[PDB]
Amino acid sequence: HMVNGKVALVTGAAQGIGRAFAEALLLKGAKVALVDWNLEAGVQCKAALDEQFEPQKTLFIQCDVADQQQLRDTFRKVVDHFGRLDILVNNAGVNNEKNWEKTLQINLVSVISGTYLGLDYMSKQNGGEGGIIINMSSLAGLMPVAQQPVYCASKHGIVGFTRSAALAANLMNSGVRLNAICPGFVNTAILESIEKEENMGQYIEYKDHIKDMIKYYGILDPPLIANGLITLIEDDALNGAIMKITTSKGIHFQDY
Amino acid sequence: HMVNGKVALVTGAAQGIGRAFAEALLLKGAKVALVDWNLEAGVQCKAALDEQFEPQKTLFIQCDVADQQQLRDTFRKVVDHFGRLDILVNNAGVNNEKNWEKTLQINLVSVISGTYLGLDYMSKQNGGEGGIIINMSSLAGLMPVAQQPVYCASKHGIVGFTRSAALAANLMNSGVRLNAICPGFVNTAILESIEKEENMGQYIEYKDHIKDMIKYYGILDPPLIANGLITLIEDDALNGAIMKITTSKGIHFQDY
Numbered sequence A, B: 001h002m003v004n005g006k007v008a009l010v011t012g013a014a015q016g017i018g019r020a021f022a023e024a025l026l027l028k029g030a031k032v033a034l035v036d037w038n039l040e041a042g043v044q045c046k047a048a049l050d051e052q053f054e055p056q057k058t059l060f061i062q063c064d065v066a067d068q069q070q071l072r073d074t075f076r077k078v079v080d081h082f083g084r085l086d087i088l089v090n091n092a093g094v095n096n097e098k099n100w101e102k103t104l105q106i107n108l109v110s111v112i113s114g115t116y117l118g119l120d121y122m123s124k125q126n127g128g129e130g131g132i133i134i135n136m137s138s139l140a141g142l143m144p145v146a147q148q149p150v151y152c153a154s155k156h157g158i159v160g161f162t163r164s165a166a167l168a169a170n171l172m173n174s175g176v177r178l179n180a181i182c183p184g185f186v187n188t189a190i191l192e193s194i195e196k197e198e199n200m201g202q203y204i205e206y207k208d209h210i211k212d213m214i215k216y217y218g219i220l221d222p223p224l225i226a227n228g229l230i231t232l233i234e235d236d237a238l239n240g241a242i243m244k245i246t247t248s249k250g251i252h253f254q255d256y
């Protein structure tokens, strides 16, 4: 289908949701490039995947997504190695309200820069044969959170940018589809950032609320988030859609 | 009431909506500091206002909101001159998709930096007697726009940050209220930015759509937007609310 024999570039694939994405894509029969700033974690992940699939179907590149030149050298290294780019996934993110400027830079700016860098290669006008770009958001992009003000700001921006760029691409005859995912609580190391003042700052005194709400709702395993990505990729007529994943309902879509 | 004898700091007050805000506040009996990066326009505005009100109620400081140190030096210059800060309005903004990074920096980052600088002075925990912070957004912060992708991203983030910070302030016992305004098309020079590829880039070929939309939706006078800010200020029990101004309906509130 639209997965076999296709090249995918995934950001933040050393651990967690990105690693699950890469595993699913490799299982479906694709060639994957893994981008992360943590070298040891990425190398260990590649070694782990090399025990299941063939080594060539995988590549690892170290890069900080905030630095634009690194991303541009990363996109060019991938294309010169495989031959074409067909799937892009922008998933890297952090949580830090003390250093709220770096969080905004990583979460929001890098997504837009990657989206643009990807349209520069995948577009019909520039010689491409189309493809699909997916940007990762959170339920914090649709509801407010008292203890994560700057983090909420970034997810909302991601949602708006994705929705606008979908229509823009439809107008330009680019052959590219754009969609976003909005998951709930996921069992990853990021949750541990809640319990440390270095990441929370003046909001640490109110972490018990988030702890209680996690106890209420529950946590979702990283593999279930990946199936949603695969579902997005194989559907041809999905552009500008927002996916919500919840433990109570499942995979559903926001309505406007 | 809560307007007389109070100090207000307004950003982007040289021309347009900010100037209307300043005029309304001065008419109601307040002392106003005008912040803009255009020196000539600000000086001319201050001279124009000096012909109506007393000079001692008007202060003009020329600062770029993006540079944090300038913003910190402006806030301290304002307090050391008057004596206290009671109202803050973050209204400065631009529209440029070609240089989409500077637009994001000006529209979103500066708003958060100013809100935080303002809470550092207005909060009871730090010796203050409270006050009100207002951040300017657009209807593009609630609906997508094909030709203004990065601009749409900046307004959504503003809305999310304001909604979260309102609850955060309610929890901390700060005595500060936070709300935002989401106007429609307003008769200002910013509209002229649509007709220039310098400000639009690859999206210039699709400006005719906005042109028809501007004509159909009509236009709103800046003093009418100023009547909304005053309404927000005099209402004590409004925190975390979003105002929408339209030519068909009027002044109304988003519901969640």
Ligand SMILES: NC(=O)C1=CN([C@@H]2O[C@H](COP(=O)(O)OP(=O)(O)OC[C@H]3O[C@@H](n4cnc5c(N)ncnc54)[C@H](O)[C@@H]3O)[C@@H](O)[C@H]2O)C=CC1
Binding pocket: A011, A012, A013, A014, A015, A016, A017, A018, A035, A036, A037, A038, A063, A064, A065, A066, A091, A092, A093, A094, A106, A136, A137, A138, A139, A182, A183, A184, A185, A186, A187, A188, A189, A190, A191
């Ligand atoms: N886990 C959760 O509860 C939720 C997470 N998300 C989002 O999911 C995405 C993935 O995060 P998780 O896997 O949950 O967390 P994680 O912390 O386990 O993984 C994030 C990955 O991003 C990488 N990364 C961070 N900044 C980077 C940078 N500047 N350059 C390159 N790589 C960078 C890290 O090395 C790490 O491998 C993030 O955007 C996060 O905000 C959204 C919904 C909820």
Ligand SMILES: NC(=O)C1=CN([C@@H]2O[C@H](COP(=O)(O)OP(=O)(O)OC[C@H]3O[C@@H](n4cnc5c(N)ncnc54)[C@H](O)[C@@H]3O)[C@@H](O)[C@H]2O)C=CC1
Binding pocket: B011, B012, B013, B014, B015, B016, B017, B018, B035, B036, B037, B038, B063, B064, B065, B066, B091, B092, B093, B094, B106, B136, B137, B138, B139, B182, B183, B184, B185, B186, B187, B188, B189, B190, B191
């Ligand atoms: N006019 C409209 O149709 C709408 C405008 N808005 C928003 O209203 C706000 C006010 O803009 P308008 O009065 O309409 O436009 P305008 O272009 O007439 O005025 C903007 C003002 O901001 C100042 N400014 C811009 N960047 C600055 C910076 N970095 N530092 C200091 N001053 C800076 C400019 O000198 C100017 O005086 C903006 O945030 C805009 O996005 C929202 C709804 C629609």
Ligand SMILES: CCCC[S@@H](O)c1sc2nc(-c3nccs3)cc(-c3cnc(C)n3C)c2c1N
Binding pocket: A094, A095, A138, A139, A140, A143, A144, A145, A146, A148, A183, A184, A185, A190, A191, A193, A210, A213, A217, A246, A247
């Ligand atoms: C850095 C920490 C990463 C986790 S956040 O993006 C995140 S995910 C999430 N999911 C939910 C769910 N609601 C219903 C089913 S699941 C809720 C929250 C959340 C936490 N605090 C609030 C006010 N909210 C809305 C959050 C929340 N704050």
Ligand SMILES: CCCC[S@@H](O)c1sc2nc(-c3nccs3)cc(-c3cnc(C)n3C)c2c1N
Binding pocket: B094, B095, B138, B139, B140, B143, B144, B145, B146, B148, B183, B184, B185, B190, B191, B193, B210, B213, B217, B246, B247
């Ligand atoms: C830099 C130009 C500044 C004007 S933008 O923030 C702005 S204000 C506005 N207002 C409206 C109104 N809708 C109903 C009554 S008024 C519509 C738009 C707009 C323009 N293009 C679209 C798709 N939209 C939604 C816009 C729009 N794009």
